[PDB]
Copies of this chain bind each other. A is one copy, B any other.
């Protein structure tokens, strides 16, 4: 039951991750609020969760580093003893046109946004396969789907995440574990590409993540990419 389930959300301190943490806890899930450096933001997310009648803890971990991913999971299990949903939300950008892009700026975006997804997903997969249940939601981006100048690294990483999602969905499906992606568009030069003529709100992405993560209907949904983008892609 949702009130006994546990969610791990990476980079959950602000924006989409914060809203996702709040949304998941609102369904009754216990939530691990992961952060890299911004402990204060994370503590405030936890506080809000507790104020609204839920449980949560803030755990520091840079999810580009395997060692720290292990510890993030370890701490999550110590406190809550299980993991039911993983939301891979941690990411960075280092925008620059291709011809100016330093290797380190390519590599840092690949390391966290793509390899970080591999590391966390591999770590929770074993747990989910054992208990024969689980839902994994990877945060991709419209940039990954349509391309966007100045983001050759970010779009490569985010598209990588989508391909990774489809494969892992197929690997874990026999145990009923779902694996999906959510693609936010422009979330609070731009509006001409957004039919709904406004920026999205983080709650709107969070609500969609929460549908995939917790709705009984989404037990039969896996390997998909759900866009929350005002109509930007299709």
Contact = CB atoms under 8 A, between A and B. Distances in A.
Interface of A: 166, 169-170, 173-174, 176, 178, 195-198, 200-201, 203-208, 210-211, 215-231, 233-234
18 contacts: A170-B231, A173-B196, A173-B231, A195-B222, A195-B223, A196-B220, A196-B222, A203-B217, A204-B216, A204-B220, A204-B221, A208-B218, A220-B230, A223-B231, A223-B233, A224-B226, A224-B227, A225-B234
Interface SS majority for chain A: mixed
A231 B222 contact: yes
A176 to B, nearest CB: 7
Contacts of A207: 215-218
Given A176-B196, A211-B215, A220-B229, 4 more contacts: A195-B223, A217-B228, A222-B231, A224-B227
Most chain B beta-carbon neighbours within 10 Å: one of A200, A223, A225: A223
A119 to B, nearest CB: 23
Contact of A206 (B174, B197, B201, B217): B217
A198 to B, nearest CB: 8
Nearest to A222: B231
- By Cβ-Cβ distance, the 7 closest A-B pairs, closest first, are A207-B217, A173-B195, A222-B231, A223-B231, A204-B220, A200-B220, A223-B234
Contact of A211 (B176, B211, B222, B223): B211
Nearest to A232: B223
Contact of A221 (B166, B217, B225, B228): B228
A55 to B, nearest CB: 23
Contacts of A230: 173, 220, 222
A51 to B, nearest CB: 21
Contacts of A219: 204
Most chain B beta-carbon neighbours within 10 Å: one of A210, A225, A234: A234
Contacts of A196: 173, 176, 178, 220, 222
A176 B231 CA distance: 11
